[PDB]
Amino acid sequence: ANIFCTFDHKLSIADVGKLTKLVAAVVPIPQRLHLIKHYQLGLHQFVDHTRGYVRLRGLLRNMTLTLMRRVEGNQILLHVPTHGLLYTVLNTGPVTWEKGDALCVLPPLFQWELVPWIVPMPLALEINQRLLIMGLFSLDRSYEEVKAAVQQLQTITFRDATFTIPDPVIDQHLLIDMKTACLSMSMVANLASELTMTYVRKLALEDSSMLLVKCQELLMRLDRERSQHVSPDDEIARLSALFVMLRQLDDLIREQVVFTVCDVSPDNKSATCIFKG
Amino acid sequence: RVASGAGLPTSRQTTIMVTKYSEKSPITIPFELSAACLTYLRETFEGTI
């Protein structure tokens, strides 16, 4: 495949030298179209005050990923990678990679601009769940020990990485997509915790194995360390709401493996990698 | 670029341009000359020895 992007504006030669320094990096693309404007290039079409992080991670799933091949003075050769063959990427993220790292793709948080971080999979996962529990704490921040937990929650320890992840709550207000994400997690936890007691009875009238017995034992330990004849349509609404608000969490519970990396250039500015995507 | 890696292609254009700015500096000197001697030359006197 081949992607051609252009510029209707005018391009300074110092900006040309700035652009060819980004010789092989990843640029997201909304649709694999042969000719494209540069207003579809990068993530500057989705930045605002209100979306933040979960909208960006949910939006970069259904977008495709390219790699820049060469730079001419008025058009950039973007080359969509294919599965199986290996490629050459550049480390634009503050993380430095090692051999064998499965690389993940993530929006960078910390009249037009071009901006995405390429983080290895465990660091991406741990900052994902760190931002998640930092959004869970975000309503009751008037106390001090939860504020110390938030301050411990900001900084992550990694090889040459002292990062200050930004505060998801701002002006005592959480953004609405993080609000729906943490609400979905709280409701799937609650709905699980009160429907497994009914459905372990509503399933063990069939052939019962010992897993059902230990399941009910675990549930009675839960119910005693914490503290049935339902209408059919309310029950249907419970189960369907459980599964549909679970369905909007697939972006957060998985990790799309994108690159499998190989031998690395010195100073960790570029790395040869396979596109497993 | 040395190509001694089978697993590593460099994949660089290798024609980076650099921008170097100049600085001007004028160099002057005052240069005097007696004009009474200048009349002896620009008028080509042919009088005597």
> Tokens 């020990």, residue?
A145
How many angstroms separate the Cα of B19 from the Cα of each of A15, A17, B16?
12, 10, 10
Return d(Cα A275, Cα B14) in angstroms, integer. 25
Return d(Cα A4, Cα A76) in angstroms, integer. 6
Q: Where are the beta strands (DSSP E) in A206-251?
A: none
Structure tokens belonging to residue A121: 């999979």
Cβ-Cβ contacts under 8 Å between A and B: the total is 22
Residues of chain A that touch chain B, judged by Cβ-Cβ distance less than 8 Å: 13-14, 17, 20, 23-24, 70, 88, 262-263, 265, 272
Return d(Cα A35, Cα A33) in angstroms, integer. 6
> Tokens 């990068």, residue?
A42
- Pairing type for strands A161-162 and A259-264 reads unpaired
Are B5 and A263 inside 8 Å of each other by CB? yes
Q: Are A91 and A147 in contact (CB under 8 A)?
A: no
Q: Which residues contact B40 (CB under 8 A, 6 or more apart)?
A: none
Rg for chain B (alpha carbons), in Å?
A: 33
Chain B CB contacts of A18 under 8 Å are none
**Helix ranges, chain B (H):** 35-41
